[PDB]
Enzyme design. Structure first.
Site, PDB file in Angstrom:
ATOM      1  CE  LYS A 146      -2.784   5.460   0.832  1.00 58.24           C
ATOM      2  NZ  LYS A 146      -1.886   4.484   1.506  1.00 58.24           N
TER       3      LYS A 146
ATOM      4  CG  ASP B 116      -1.744   1.171   1.403  1.00 60.02           C
ATOM      5  OD1 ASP B 116      -2.085   1.798   0.378  1.00 60.02           O
ATOM      6  OD2 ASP B 116      -2.057   1.500   2.565  1.00 60.02           O
TER       7      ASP B 116
END
Lengths: 223, 224
Positions: free
Chosen positions: A62, A60
């Protein structure tokens, strides 16, 4: 492989503390999320350790960067062998696209490619600062559609948007939603709203015998 | 771990052995090094320490764009890592930039420089149509530059085409980091003149045969 929709957030600043937890549960039971916390502290190297214990990892991170770079970043995650990786939709189409096209050579080994839309934390106020006229909600959806248009596998999205997004984008468009709590949806409500992967943190990680905790969640999800 | 150069060379290698080779050909005095998403995803903080132990200053170029608490966690971690500069995305918003800064406060002047990306160098007007932005890249970056300053960070990543106007608008203590620098797309020469505070140079150096000459020549040219 696992049948659960549950993804547990590993948000430890101690590596051996996380594996302890991790060792008290089972890959068949759920997948794991490594975010910016653990990854800035520990890098790919710790992902491997989680992978060595057979888990499926949601990296995760991004990625939000220029297309060339974003591309290289996502390839790297795939080389790492993670299960899922996200990007920011707000990086735009060429970025998303280049992200996607980077994953083509990994074929059926390529990770799920998911886009952040509007962060769960960003309020309307925050968006005006940026000079954006649409509500967070409206703007997340625009970002969802762009993502779909760009050929990505899904979106991260709030429970509050989960129902309309499934109705609008359909079922091969994975819905990743955070802030799920057995007891903000419940694992059960989330299932019903149609969300595919439900990220759970403290509820599980702070459970004494989190494994029972887990076990109850998916049994609860059996119906 | 001072140098007097405003040069920051982009390490964007897929293989570490090659990165360190290049590194071994040059000198901490001559430039700074920038670590981005590529090398970091491949090699982690561990590789930053490799560079930092060879005396270099690193620009950890990961442009954190995440929720406040989290970006805060990453920035602090960047600091503990001991890097010289770290950036965040302005588009993460004020609350985020704010949490970043405050995270750094326990580090006194040990704190790294905290830089915000405004409008990424690559984004065209077109790209912003998609997002639904009315303002041109330029106008939007500037809006983002002020939010950054208002949030009290040390500067912004910005294009050479905006370096002059930003120095004028935000002043000189507002650090300007710019990429796309090329000896001979501003030049090291032109860039300084615009007032850009740190110039990121890629391939010209890394893909230079005798880049250490190349580097030292770069700074000779800034003898002026």
């Amino acid at each position: 492989v696992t049948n659960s929709p549950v993804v547990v957030a590993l948000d430890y600043h101690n590596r051996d503390d996380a594996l302890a937890f991790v060792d008290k549960i089972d890959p068949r039971d759920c997948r794991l999320k490594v975010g910016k916390e653990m990854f800035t502290l520990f890098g790919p190297q710790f992902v491997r350790e989680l992978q060595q214990r057979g888990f499926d990892i949601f990296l995760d991170l991004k990625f939000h960067d220029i297309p060339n770079t974003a591309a290289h970043a996502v390839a790297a995650a795939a080389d790492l062998g993670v299960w899922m990786v996200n990007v920011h939709a707000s990086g735009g189409a060429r970025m998303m696209t280049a992200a996607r096209e980077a994953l083509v050579p990994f074929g059926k080994d390529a990770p799920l490619l998911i886009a952040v839309t509007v962060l769960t934390s960003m309020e309307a106020s925050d968006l005006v600062d940026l000079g954006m006229t649409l509500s967070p909600a409206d703007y997340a959806e625009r970002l969802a559609a762009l993502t779909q248009k760009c050929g990505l596998d899904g979106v991260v999205c709030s429970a509050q948007e989960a129902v309309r997004f499934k109705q609008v984008f359909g079922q091969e468009f994975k819905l990743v939603t955070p802030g799920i709590r057995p007891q903000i949806m419940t694992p059960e409500q989330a299932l019903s709203a149609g969300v595919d992967y439900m990220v759970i943190g403290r509820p599980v990680t702070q459970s004494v015998d989190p494994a029972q905790t887990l076990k109850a969640i998916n049994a609860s999800l059996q119906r």
